[PDB]
Design a binder for this molecule. Structure first.
Ligand code: 9II
Lengths: 231, 11
């Protein structure tokens, strides 16, 4: 079970630090938590007003990865539009609390499956909640979360990209470092790396359904601007 | 298009 190379330990440091500096409320998300009261456009309203800072945190995460910063702005835009809801969904799923059955948004707002579903997310709310439940036994630390985020960001198959092959190599570096970190961490769950790769697929489905749903059916001034831009 | 995101990226 190969463990992290030194060049991979500093990539682990770079990514973990980027995640921790752009992750809302850091460790005090549970205490700061505030429980909230077809589509409820009033529930919708409350959610659209609170997605802008969550999108901005993803932008900030990416900007703290030098490999991201090396790409042309046209590719940076494409990578961020692709992975934004994938990372927001992971960051909320890892904050699943089984006792209240809530996820935490912006490190401060606890929401139920029914609330998020009626905020306009539909089946995506069940997919995010199910992921959170499945992730409770994975005991993902900040490093494992940051690396998953970095794998999702460096997706070479987003349409319209120019630097397809450089982005692929960035991702291969992250995947190798991450598997080696997982070897070092020796989790007590069988076939951990294969099961983690299935969780990536789960997040990609959330990203592809999110994007599809925006497109579908829906007055757009009612949507935050940064959120119209990411669909 | 993608002009807020562009501003936020280029700093
Ligand atoms: C995963 O989803 C979300 N995560 C966070 C977040 O903070 N995550 C944890 C973290 O980053 O620390 C939020 O802050 C969110 C705010 C509003 C929101 O609301 C929507 C979005 C899309 C739609 C939608 C999409 C497509 C079509 C129709 C509606 C509806 C409500 C969804 C949020």
């Amino acid at each position: 079970k190969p463990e992290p190379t030194d060049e991979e330990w500093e990539l682990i440091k770079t990514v973990t630090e980027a995640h921790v500096a752009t992750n809302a409320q850091g460790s005090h998300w549970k205490q700061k938590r505030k429980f909230l009261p077809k589509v409820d456009l009033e529930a919708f309203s409350h959610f659209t007003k609170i997605i802008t800072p969550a999108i901005t945190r993803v932008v900030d995460f990416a900007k703290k990865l030098p490999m991201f910063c090396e790409l042309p702005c046209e590719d940076q835009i494409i990578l961020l539009k692709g992975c934004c809801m994938e990372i927001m969904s992971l960051r909320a799923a890892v904050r699943y609390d089984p006792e209240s059955e809530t996820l935490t948004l912006n490190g401060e707002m606890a929401v139920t499956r029914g609330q998020l579903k009626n905020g306009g997310l539909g089946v995506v709310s069940d997919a995010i909640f199910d992921l959170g439940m499945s992730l409770s036994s994975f005991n993902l630390d900040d490093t494992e979360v940051a690396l998953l985020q970095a794998v999702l960001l460096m997706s070479s198959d987003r349409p319209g990209l120019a630097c397809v092959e450089r982005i692929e190599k960035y991702q291969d570096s992250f995947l190798l470092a991450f598997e080696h970190y997982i070897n070092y961490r020796k989790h007590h769950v069988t076939h951990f790396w294969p099961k983690l790769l299935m969780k990536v697929t789960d997040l990609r489905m959330i990203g592809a359904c999110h994007a599809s749903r925006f497109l579908h059916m829906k007055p757009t001034e009612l949507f935050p601007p940064l959120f119209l831009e990411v669909f | 298009e993608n002009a807020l995101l562009r501003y936020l990226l280029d700093k």
